[PDB]
Amino acid sequence: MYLIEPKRNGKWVFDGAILLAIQYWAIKNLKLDETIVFPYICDPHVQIGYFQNPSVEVNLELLKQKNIEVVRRDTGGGAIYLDRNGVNFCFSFPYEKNKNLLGNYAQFYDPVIKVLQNIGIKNVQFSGKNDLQIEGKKVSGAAMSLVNDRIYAGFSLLYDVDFDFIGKILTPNQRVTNLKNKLSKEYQNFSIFEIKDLFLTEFLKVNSVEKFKKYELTDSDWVQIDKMVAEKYKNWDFVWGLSPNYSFNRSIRTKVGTITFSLEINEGKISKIKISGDFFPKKSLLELENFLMGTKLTQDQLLNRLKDAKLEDYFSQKIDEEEICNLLLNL
Ligand SMILES: Nc1ncnc2c1ncn2[C@@H]1O[C@H](COP(=O)(O)OC(=O)CCCC[C@@H]2CCSS2)[C@@H](O)[C@H]1O
């Protein structure tokens, strides 16, 4: 198991966008045939999933007011708020050695639950979706995707929360707790760097690993990471361009999550379409949106096109194609 701390010439980095960039850089460029761990503690910012639209997920005025960034990550899932009171861990798992991990939140979280138990946390449970919950209240969210031969997976930990701010800055569908007061009393006043440390030590134990193999980002890695920051994580086209607000917007709750269709209509046909939501598609939806372009907004064309798109190739659960058809027929 490798550990990549987000350090630059020995300085700890807290920029959420750079932190993802580090991870994705590793994913793409670090051919280590071992799990790499990426602990990260970020300055306040909102991180949204790849398929999400920041405009509908964030209170944009509160974000501007508080002068904090939106950062889109590469994985699906939903929008989280991240500050110095959260400790997150991403991973680059060799896909061949963890073939059953893709989409398997339970497996992914098993060592985490184990770590949290070991650390005195009451009754942390896998939510069954992609979360960890104590007595109804979410303490962690997770996301993953397959990229190259690597599974990119990450979970957050809400060590301490600003409950007021979190429910104000995130506008989903328009509840969570801290871990601080829930650890063994020995740990209850640990700072965030101490929790990260405690968690990583515990994570090694729970995973039967004596020590992390050391990987320090070199100047040269940083040049590539900085480039991915410029071209992607802090690139408007990626953060904002990716999810345009088209004229018509409809959403359905489905098993995979809330799917929103944002589309343009010219001559009774879908002219532009953007499918967004907090889900975890099997492959990129760009192909599906492209497939749907040109479809007449009639039952017959929509049903057929939606059938032909083989939605199961794109989403894990079954989507009601007719639900989507009928939703779109109303425009
Ligand atoms: N920092 C944070 N951590 C955990 N849960 C949060 C957080 N912020 C908000 N929430 C709550 O989760 C829901 C949205 O959860 P939802 O289930 O929609 O999706 C997620 O959680 C994505 C997890 C983040 C993936 C990153 C890849 C490695 S590190 S983390 C939001 O509305 C809040 O109620």
Author numbering: 1 to 174, 188 to 344
Would you copy out the relevant sentences from the publication that reported this structure?
Lipoate protein ligases (Lpls) are responsible for the metabolism of lipoic acid. Specific enzymes catalyze the covalent attachment of lipoic acid to the acyltransferase (E2) subunit or H protein of the glycine cleavage system (GcvH) via an amide linkage between the ε-amino group of a specific lysine residue of these proteins and the lipoic acid carboxyl group. Here, a new lipoate protein ligase from M. hyopneumoniae was verified, and its structure was solved. Mhp-Lpl is composed of a large N-terminal domain (residues 1–254), a small C-terminal domain (residues 260–344), and a short polypeptide (residues 255–259) between the two domains.
